Amino acid sequence: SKICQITGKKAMVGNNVSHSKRRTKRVFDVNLFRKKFYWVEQDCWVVLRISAAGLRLINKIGLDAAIKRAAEKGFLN
Amino acid sequence: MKIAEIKELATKELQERLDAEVAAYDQMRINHAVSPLDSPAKLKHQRRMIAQMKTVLRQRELN
Amino acid sequence: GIIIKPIISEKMTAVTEKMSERYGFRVSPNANKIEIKKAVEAMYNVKVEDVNTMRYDGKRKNRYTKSGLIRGKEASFKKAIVTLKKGETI
Amino acid sequence: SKLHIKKGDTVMVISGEDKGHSGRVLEVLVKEQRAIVEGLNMIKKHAKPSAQGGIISKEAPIHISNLNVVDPKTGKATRIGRRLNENGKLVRYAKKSGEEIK
Amino acid sequence: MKRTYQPSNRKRLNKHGFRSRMATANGRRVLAARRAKGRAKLTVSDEF
RNA sequence: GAAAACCCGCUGUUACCCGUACCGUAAACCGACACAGGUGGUUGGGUUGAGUAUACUAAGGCGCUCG
RNA sequence: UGUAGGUAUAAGUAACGAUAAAGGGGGCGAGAACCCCCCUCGCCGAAAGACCAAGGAUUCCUGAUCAACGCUAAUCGGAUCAGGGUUAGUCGGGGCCUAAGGAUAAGCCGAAUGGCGAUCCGAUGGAAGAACCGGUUAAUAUUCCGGUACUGAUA
RNA sequence: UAAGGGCAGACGGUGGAUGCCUAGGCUCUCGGAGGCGAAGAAGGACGUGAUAAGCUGCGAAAAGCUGCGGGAAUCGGCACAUACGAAUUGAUCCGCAGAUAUCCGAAUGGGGCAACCCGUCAGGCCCCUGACACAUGAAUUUUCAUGAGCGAACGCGGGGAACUGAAACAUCUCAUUACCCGUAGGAGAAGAAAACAAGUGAUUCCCUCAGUAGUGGCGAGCGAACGGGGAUUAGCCCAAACCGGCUUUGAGUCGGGGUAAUAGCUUCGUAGAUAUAGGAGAACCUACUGGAAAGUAUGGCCGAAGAGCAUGAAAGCUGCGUAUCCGACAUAUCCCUGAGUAGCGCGGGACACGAAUCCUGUGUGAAUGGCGGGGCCCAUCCCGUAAGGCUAAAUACUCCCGAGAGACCGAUAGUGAACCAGU
Numbered sequence A: 001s002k003i004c005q006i007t008g009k010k011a012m013v014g015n016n017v018s019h020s021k022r023r024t025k026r027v028f029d030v031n032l033f034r035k036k037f038y039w040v041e042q043d044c045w046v047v048l049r050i051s052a053a054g055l056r057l058i059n060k061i062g063l064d065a066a067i068k069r070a071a072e073k074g075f076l077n
Numbered sequence B: 001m002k003i004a005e006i007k008e009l010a011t012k013e014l015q016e017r018l019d020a021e022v023a024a025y026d027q028m029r030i031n032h033a034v035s036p037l038d039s040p041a042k043l044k045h046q047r048r049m050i051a052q053m054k055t056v057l058r059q060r061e062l063n
Numbered sequence C: 001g002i003i004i005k006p007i008i009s010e011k012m013t014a015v016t017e018k019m020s021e022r023y024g025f026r027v028s029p030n031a032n033k034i035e036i037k038k039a040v041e042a043m044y045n046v047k048v049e050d051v052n053t054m055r056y057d058g059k060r061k062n063r064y065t066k067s068g069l070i071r072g073k074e075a076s077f078k079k080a081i082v083t084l085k086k087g088e089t090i
Numbered sequence D: 001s002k003l004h005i006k007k008g009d010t011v012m013v014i015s016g017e018d019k020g021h022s023g024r025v026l027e028v029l030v031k032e033q034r035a036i037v038e039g040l041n042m043i044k045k046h047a048k049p050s051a052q053g054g055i056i057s058k059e060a061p062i063h064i065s066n067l068n069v070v071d072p073k074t075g076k077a078t079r080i081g082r083r084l085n086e087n088g089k090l091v092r093y094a095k096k097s098g099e100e101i102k
Numbered sequence E: 001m002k003r004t005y006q007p008s009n010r011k012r013l014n015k016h017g018f019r020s021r022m023a024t025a026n027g028r029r030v031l032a033a034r035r036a037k038g039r040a041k042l043t044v045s046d047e048f
Numbered sequence F: 001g002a003a004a005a006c007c008c009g010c011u012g013u014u015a016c017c018c019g020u021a022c023c024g025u026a027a028a029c030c031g032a033c034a035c036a037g038g039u040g041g042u043u044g045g046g047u048u049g050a051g052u053a054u055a056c057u058a059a060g061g062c063g064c065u066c067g
Numbered sequence G: 001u002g003u004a005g006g007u008a009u010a011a012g013u014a015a016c017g018a019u020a021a022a023g024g025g026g027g028c029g030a031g032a033a034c035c036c037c038c039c040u041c042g043c044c045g046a047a048a049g050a051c052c053a054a055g056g057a058u059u060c061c062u063g064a065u066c067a068a069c070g071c072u073a074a075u076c077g078g079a080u081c082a083g084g085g086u087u088a089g090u091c092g093g094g095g096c097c098u099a100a101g102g103a104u105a106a107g108c109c110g111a112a113u114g115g116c117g118a119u120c121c122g123a124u125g126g127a128a129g130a131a132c133c134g135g136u137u138a139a140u141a142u143u144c145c146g147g148u149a150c151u152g153a154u155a
Numbered sequence H: 001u002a003a004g005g006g007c008a009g010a011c012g013g014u015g016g017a018u019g020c021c022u023a024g025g026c027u028c029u030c031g032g033a034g035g036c037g038a039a040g041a042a043g044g045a046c047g048u049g050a051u052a053a054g055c056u057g058c059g060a061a062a063a064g065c066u067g068c069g070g071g072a073a074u075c076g077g078c079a080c081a082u083a084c085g086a087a088u089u090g091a092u093c094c095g096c097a098g099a100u101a102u103c104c105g106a107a108u109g110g111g112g113c114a115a116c117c118c119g120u121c122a123g124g125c126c127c128c129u130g131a132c133a134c135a136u137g138a139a140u141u142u143u144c145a146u147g148a149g150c151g152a153a154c155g156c157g158g159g160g161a162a163c164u165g166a167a168a169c170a171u172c173u174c175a176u177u178a179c180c181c182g183u184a185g186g187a188g189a190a191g192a193a194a195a196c197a198a199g200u201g202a203u204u205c206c207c208u209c210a211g212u213a214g215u216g217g218c219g220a221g222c223g224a225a226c227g228g229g230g231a232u233u234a235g236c237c238c239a240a241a242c243c244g245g246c247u248u249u250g251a252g253u254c255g256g257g258g259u260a261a262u263a264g265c266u267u268c269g270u271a272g273a274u275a276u277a278g279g280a281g282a283a284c285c286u287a288c289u290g291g292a293a294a295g296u297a298u299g300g301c302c303g304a305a306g307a308g309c310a311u312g313a314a315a316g317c318u319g320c321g322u323a324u325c326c327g328a329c330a331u332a333u334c335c336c337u338g339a340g341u342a343g344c345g346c347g348g349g350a351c352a353c354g355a356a357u358c359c360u361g362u363g364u365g366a367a368u369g370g371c372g373g374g375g376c377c378c379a380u381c382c383c384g385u386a387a388g389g390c391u392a393a394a395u396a397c398u399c400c401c402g403a404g405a406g407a408c409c410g411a412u413a414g415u416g417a418a419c420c421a422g423u
């Protein structure tokens, strides 16, 4: 249950494909990390387990709006 | 005693008769084992009458 | 009514001819000594001194049908040897 | 299902070794649908001495479809139906003469 | 010669008893399969 | 060359629950058997002996379920 | 070298499971090498005697029965049927405590099912408050009976 | 002389073949129904009878208790039973509604080796008892409803083989199968064009198109769509522009419920019926054979009834029934226009397709008539209007209930199980 709390991204299942077209099962993993954020609106510090895409969304539209949108989409819990 | 007679009680004499009949049934059960009764159907009669009394008491308490 | 039936047997007859204040009952397996005592006081209007108990499991028996054989069991019970106060009988 | 005969009725044997003989119903065995008719279908049972023994003569049951209710007008062993003549209560009546059976 | 079966009631109930079967998901799978087959005895807790 | 509870200084009335039969170096347990096997602990008299070895023998138990 | 059931052949043959061993007199009985009583003989005796535990689960005692079971017969039996039999304040266990280990809390990890993770559980260990001499059953006895005691609560 | 033996016949034994029989199976049709459970389930333990209970039923009120409706003489369940009782003042039995319902089990006061051990708090009895409460997670405001577990098939989703085929084998196949896991409902899923096409007009299912177009170590193989004919037919609702009210925050930015209105072109200024008990329901004599007629032969009768089952042999007229008609006290059912978006690079996947369409792990990233699609890429043309949502019908299945059927089986068959069978 390592899922990005902002975007909901989880690991994907795919194939390693060799030059002779041999196919082996594999996982594409999320670029996931825990980061501490300063929430200005509440003037607090919150630790979020997020992906780099989630960090991009936060840097685009602000942390408060991103948190509200993730909560309304059900990713945050 | 019969169903009509039991239903024509007063919910206090009925309770007193309930304990009295329970004790009497215990005595007859103990006595029938020592001496086999001529008519053991009195035991069935008393058991059914105790069940009837408890039924009527439950009816009166519930409604 | 935890008391099921009195015990009529040679051993009970011998102990009652010896002591005469001792009586054996067969009762439900889950009734302990205090309730056995209160029950015999209620059922016989006597004062009780001491109670001794022992648990019996049912005998295994062989029910015989037309074709073959079935294995069955008798019910379990509890023995209760009851000592009345010196002066009273049952 | 309610039966066309009952204890205390007088019936007539319409088939069997006792064909053409009338008697009184003593007991009805509803589960196997047989009845005991007084004096009819005698059997000799061998009984060991128990509560002197011997050879007891007794009555053996007859299947109820071999028995018909006797008409109380000519004793002709009619068929019966049911109607509500007696104050609307269902009663048994003979078909050969229309008279009720009491 | 020591044979394979060396009885011990505590070990029997620890290894195959009703509570040990109910502890895990696969033990509950075993219980469901035995109930579906209709076995008169469900675990070793039944025997006496 | 365990731990924790615990334990130190800081005159009547009563007495609850379960087991208790029987086998258990075995004909009753584990070996498909009334199977020459396996099964943890205690006790184990007298003479002889270093001995709980060996031989004989009390108490006790057996003569091994075809002749 | 097919399957189930039944029946043959080898054949009245192999075998009847430790070479510790038996003889006689009475009893009961339709029937006795084998059952019951007595005398004599032999075997074990740091056991093949007496106890605790695990395991078994009525096999324990008594009366009937000898069909099947017992590697023979059986009047006998750990066999069939019925009846009877196990008695605790002090014995053992449990109620109390923890070990290995196990399940979990706060948290951590992880497609799912789930995996980890210090308080609880968990004896094979620690604590347990407290007697006896005599009798007594066909079958129980430190448990039942009589004497001598002890120990914990409660008013 | 036959000790013994051979062949045949007769009669026996053993064994259980065959023939005949059976409601025990098998496959279906039609109509319902599609769950049970914290008000304690499925499945169990222990009890319960006049006499031990092996099944069945029931639960300390224990083969059982109460009321209403039906009905009329026996009844007190079964494994070949006697006793003793109940019952026309209406038992037993059937329909509907109630009462009681021990212990374990999601098990939920704490533990535990299932059916057991140990508790706390409020009362009541009286060291011991019977009756309360005492779990956890999620909406929620400590009051409240909801959930947990089990269970046929059908649905959706997350993971996901190998044997095998290719006459070896690795791409490919087997197969987005088996299996594991999660989670619904009576169905589910899908569904109202940024669509197909070169005029049609939302989904779903059937017949064709067609083993065609394609795809493929162009091998083995895989395999559409458009169109046509049918079953069924159905379309709607938000976000914003805009109009008002409120709170908060720095005339003004948010967050709330109300109005306004959403597009191939807009907007804004039923109660009777049915079901679950029931009531009536036609018509046969004589002789023969036989243990026994329902058979045979005469002679009659009914038929909106000549289906069937039972009865001492094969019955329209012996019994239960059948055709037809009647019947319910309850209880159920019926100016604005969706942004980490379109698009793009790298690595992969699903699509019939093994690299146009659709999806995304990683890195980027617009437009507001524009944009997207028509099988690589550009231009013209045509079609449509993405980044919000809901939606019946025609379709799939049977643990169960009811009514039926078979050129299906007849005890080594048919289910493993006709009986003591998951024994």
Ligand SMILES: [K+]
Pocket (backbone or CB within 6 Å): C050, C051, C052
């Ligand atoms: K005592």
Ligand SMILES: [K+]
Pocket (backbone or CB within 6 Å): C053, C054
């Ligand atoms: K005891």
Ligand SMILES: [K+]
Pocket (backbone or CB within 6 Å): none
């Ligand atoms: K020994």
Ligand SMILES: [K+]
Pocket (backbone or CB within 6 Å): G001
């Ligand atoms: K061979």
Ligand SMILES: [K+]
Pocket (backbone or CB within 6 Å): none
């Ligand atoms: K004897």
Ligand SMILES: [K+]
Pocket (backbone or CB within 6 Å): none
């Ligand atoms: K739907």
Ligand SMILES: [K+]
Pocket (backbone or CB within 6 Å): none
């Ligand atoms: K008729």
Ligand SMILES: [K+]
Pocket (backbone or CB within 6 Å): D015, D065, D066, H311, H318
């Ligand atoms: K008849």
Ligand SMILES: [K+]
Pocket (backbone or CB within 6 Å): none
């Ligand atoms: K008929």
Ligand SMILES: [Mg+2]
Pocket (backbone or CB within 6 Å): none
């Ligand atoms: Mg026996």
Ligand SMILES: [Mg+2]
Pocket (backbone or CB within 6 Å): none
């Ligand atoms: Mg502690």
Ligand SMILES: [Mg+2]
Pocket (backbone or CB within 6 Å): none
């Ligand atoms: Mg002993």
Ligand SMILES: [Mg+2]
Pocket (backbone or CB within 6 Å): none
């Ligand atoms: Mg011994």
Ligand SMILES: [Mg+2]
Pocket (backbone or CB within 6 Å): none
């Ligand atoms: Mg041995």
Ligand SMILES: [Mg+2]
Pocket (backbone or CB within 6 Å): F034
């Ligand atoms: Mg022997």
Ligand SMILES: [Mg+2]
Pocket (backbone or CB within 6 Å): none
């Ligand atoms: Mg020693």
